[PDB]
Paper text:
Here, we investigate the capability of a deep neural network model to automate design of sequences onto protein backbones, having learned directly from crystal structure data and without any human-specified priors. We had the model fully redesign 50 four-fold symmetric sequences for the backbone and selected 8 designs for further characterization based on ranking by the model PLL and other metrics (see “Methods” section), using no information about previously confirmed sequences. Of these 8 designs, 4 are cooperatively folded proteins, as indicated by circular dichroism (CD) wavelength scans and by the presence of clear two-state transitions in thermal melt curves.
We successfully crystallized 2 model designs, [name] (1.46 Å resolution) and F15C (1.9 Å resolution), and the crystal structures validate that the sequences indeed fold into the [name]-barrel structure in agreement with the designed backbone. For [name], the C-terminal helix is dislodged, although the complete barrel is formed. We hypothesize that the design of Ala3 (and symmetric positions Ala49, Ala95, Ala141) reduces the hydrophobic volume in the core, possibly allowing other interactions in the crystallization conditions to dislodge the helix (further discussion in Supplementary Note 1). In the structure, we see that the C-terminal His tag for [name] interacts with the surface of the beta-barrel, which might also contribute to the dislodging of the C-terminal helix, although 3 of the 4 symmetric subunits are folded as expected. For [name], the model uses an isoleucine to wedge between the long and short helices and forming a Tyr-Glu-Ser polar network that extends to coordinate the loop from the beta-sheet to the short helix; for F15C, the model has a different solution, designing phenylalanine and valine residues (F10, V14) to pack the long helix against the shorter one near the top of the barrel.
Author numbering: 0 to 189
The structure:
Amino acid sequence: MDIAIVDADNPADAIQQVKDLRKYGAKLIAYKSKSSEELKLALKAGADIAIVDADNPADAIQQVKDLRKYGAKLIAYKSKSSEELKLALKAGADIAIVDADNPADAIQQVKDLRKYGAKLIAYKSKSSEELKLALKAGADIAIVDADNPADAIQQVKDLRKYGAKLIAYKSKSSEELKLALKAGHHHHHH
């Protein structure tokens, strides 16, 4: 199953991309912001996954509680700190996004969070080899980050071939989705 990550460079365009992805037939739509209020707007537009990215951990943990009370179906939390990710999960986050800079640290955090009881661990890399190591370590969601667009296609190909069940990547633009819809085309299941 694919997760489309909204990637527009401003909130108005990001909110429109949610609508375009939903119409195109994306099964899961993820939206990241440092603003709780912006994440509520993305959910109201039809996003499935609200990614908490606020810098201040006190503020970020309160956003999890606010989004849960609000009825967010899936709340993700992005941190370089496995201690912070544990606090986010205790506060009601569904998905811990491992963001640690050093790959050795990031893989140990996957193993730590699995043993802590994390239900859904996500891991991000430009490297197919690193995502396979993370999946083996117990990650549930593989986030493709390949720099240029041709690299991103190969990484998704690599993960499909591997049998990754939850593949996340940056979405096509609204203008691309709208052109496909104008032609009568929709997302096809893989």
